[PDB]
Subunit: 183 residues, 3 copies
């Protein structure tokens, strides 16, 4: 019911300019606004699909030759948005699931399918290094629920050859727990 | 009326040693002291030109084959120094200006010219990744003042082919403001 | 009397899974658990040698083709462990010593020899960028003690061609001290 918009620029100044322009252009939330090596800039927005399409249209329209890439992912479960900008609260501890993908697009699509095909909580979506790099989702819930979520997410990414690894970790060790659910 | 000294080493231990040596050698402020990938070390100093020349002389004199590069930038407006080490306080909000350059030297020279050719506040000078990488200056003030500052800075960097992008952003959006003026 | 175990994986999810598995497998402390560019994962453990051998055995046994590298360093002075995970308290200020190496293995072995061949405090062991990159140890104590420690450490690393630089810094400047002993 929500949408994610991604805009990547070769200029950090243009990135900040376009972040400003897009936020003014439509009712959208800023999820990510950061510099990526070597010196590119990444913006990710969340909001209604109409708003996101117009925001990304505005951004692409004004990027010129500084435009690197852009994407709109429609019909994304609402919990995915705060999982990109930060952390969702864990309401169950029994198990953690982690699915690692190439690309944040594959990760987002897999996380969406996971949440929609199970009763797990999507805790966070992490990008190790920009939108083309290793990304991973972390889910939490009952072991059976986590297994379902991880399977669905893995199938999503794997169909594309973009699954790196999947892991179901019941009863995570106390010394790993914080890193898993908070980073 | 002030000067900036830059010393880059291939050794982190030598960098810390030379930071110590230079600070003892003259009355200078440490502005930056950090490791840069792959494993080099960056020192930037501020102070009177005489002190900075002797500090950088000392540093270069003792660097040996670990010396990567060194520079002294003379007659730099005093506000540029704290803009490199941290943030200057914003006394006006009406507009933000951002000028992105290749190299911190070009950024410093452009920021100096901007401050000297306008009434803007130089808020900060940011290096994304070491002294040769993308850098940018952020200024704040009245829209007309910011436009002047950005034009002057852009001309400085552009004459060298080192201007990446320039942006005048009146009335920055609330969700971009903090990143612009604080990073 | 203690041991350090190192496990490196090509998968971040596998890394977190293996961190969990190894911690459950034996009585070991997690010293490091982090992602390294481009997208690998690094685990370092401390504990009794028996526990560490079994933990690393477990980790290697389950890593499969995601295994990048693994190492067990036996008979490491106990102070080296907290120097890897964080900071040891400085009980003397007179001098700082810094020895920079290629590889954390060389750094650990050099730090161990330094501590065992002197009365210095090992303050910290730092990895700039993963286990193969620039690393350095920082020691503190009386100038004579620091000189001994640095010489011993330098000989250790230098015999292998893995010494980058060694530095004895009596009476470190106030503006460098915190970075030296805390990072
Ligand atoms: Cl559940
Ligand atoms: Cl102004
Ligand atoms: Cl001592
Ligand atoms: Na649990
Ligand atoms: Na404003
Ligand atoms: Na001292």
């Amino acid at each position: 019911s929500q949408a994610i918009g991604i805009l990547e620029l070769t200029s950090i100044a243009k990135g900040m300019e376009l972040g400003d322009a897009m936020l003014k252009s439509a009712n959208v939330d800023l999820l990510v606004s950061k510099t990526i090596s070597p010196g590119k800039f990444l913006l990710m927005l969340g909001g209604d699909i109409g708003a996101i399409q117009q925001a990304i249209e505005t951004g692409t329209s004004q990027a010129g030759e500084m435009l690197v890439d852009s994407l709109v992912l429609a019909n994304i479960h609402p919990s995915v948005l705060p999982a990109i900008s930060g952390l969702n609260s864990v309401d169950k501890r029994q198990a953690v699931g982690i699915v690692e993908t190439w690309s944040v697009a594959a990760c987002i699509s897999a996380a969406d399918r996971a949440v929609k095909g199970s009763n797990v909580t999507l805790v966070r979506v992490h990008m190790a290094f920009g939108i083309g790099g290793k990304c991973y989702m972390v889910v939490a819930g009952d072991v059976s629920d986590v297994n379902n979520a991880v399977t669905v997410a893995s199938e999503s990414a794997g169909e594309k050859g973009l699954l790196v690894y999947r892991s179901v970790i019941p009863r995570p060790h106390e010394a790993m727990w914080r890193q898993m659910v908070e980073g």
